[PDB]
Design a protein around this ligand. Structure first.
Ligand SMILES: [Mg+2]
Ligand SMILES: [Mg+2]
Ligand SMILES: [Mg+2]
Length: 112
RNA sequence: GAAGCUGACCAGACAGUCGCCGCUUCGUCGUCGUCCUCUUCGGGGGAGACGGGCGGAGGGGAGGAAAGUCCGGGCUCCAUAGGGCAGGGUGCCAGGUAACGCCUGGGGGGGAAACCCACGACCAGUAAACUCCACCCGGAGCAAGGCCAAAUAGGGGUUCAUAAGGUACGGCCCGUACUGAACCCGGGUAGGCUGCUUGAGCCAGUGAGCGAUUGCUGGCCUAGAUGAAUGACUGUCCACGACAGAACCCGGCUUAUCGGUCAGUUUCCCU
């Protein structure tokens, strides 16, 4: 089962503060990814995009949707970690294929 | 036939593998210390409500601007001697609306798309050049509050309540009872459910009004999420796809929009 239930998202900011105080760098000159270990056995991810970086509410939402579709497909492969995503400045200019390959280009060096 | 305007619709459809939400129902497991009857009452059976009570089934899920600080209202909480000053808005006539800086029909001028413009007394006093002449004008907001869970005083003062609080006017003073308040000796809901999508709606028939709009009769009810809900490759009538995001709701205008199909309208004149 490749479902994406409620127990796979960082709801409260406490998990965000935990990931911030225990971070490991894994970013590009465009997108930065952080994370930390947990204990539930299944990995969880957080979604944080800055409104000041890019406006246009169809954007940011598109980034969230693409990130969810890229994360929920590899939940049975990558180890159990508490991830978090952030979007920098010039990110809304890329299309879907470029963003997808850029997101899949980072998770290869996550051998933790 | 080419070019320019206004109005109407659209700015994708179909299938293509897994998934996110909420609506209804189906049985299923606990709680009822809910109800009723039998009972071994260690309780069982049935009816309701709640809980992740586990899956199945059915049918669903972003606009012509959802976007703005540009207006008006719906619905709550707080507050409010009646007397003015001060400030703001509106200012051709007549209608629409629940209201309006919104809509419509006339007149004057402006004039040609200035067929759109302040068009309230330039003499009542030297006016998209000033005073004034009338009407109106509390504040904050679905994190408003409402219901619960839960909360766990701090013996109260120089003692007066007058200038602790301009009490509310509140920008100002006339004062209406002008108002219960200093630091120790302070510790306290962080959660849940409703508001919440039936809309001062939509469609059809039929009168009224030059117009905006409306009288009457029938039918329709699958965004409401809470780091906050839209991805997959093949063909296509692929108009080769652009501006863009719901967050309590409604009525207008204000920006942004590649463009495609019709209707009306003018110039070009092979026609
Ligand atoms: Mg919006
Ligand atoms: Mg409050
Ligand atoms: Mg809306």
């Amino acid at each position: 089962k490749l479902a994406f239930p409620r127990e796979l998202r960082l709801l409260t900011p406490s998990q965000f503060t935990f990931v911030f105080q225990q971070p490991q760098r894994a970013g590009t000159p465009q997108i930065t990814i952080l994370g930390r270990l947990n204990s539930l056995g299944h990995p969880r991810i957080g979604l944080t995009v800055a409104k000041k970086n890019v406006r246009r509410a169809h954007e940011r939402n598109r980034i969230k949707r693409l990130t969810r579709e890229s994360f929920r497909l590899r939940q049975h492969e990558l180890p159990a970690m508490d991830f978090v995503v952030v979007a920098k400045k010039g990110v809304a200019d890329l299309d879907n294929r470029a963003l997808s390959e850029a997101l899949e280009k980072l998770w290869r060096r996550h051998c933790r």
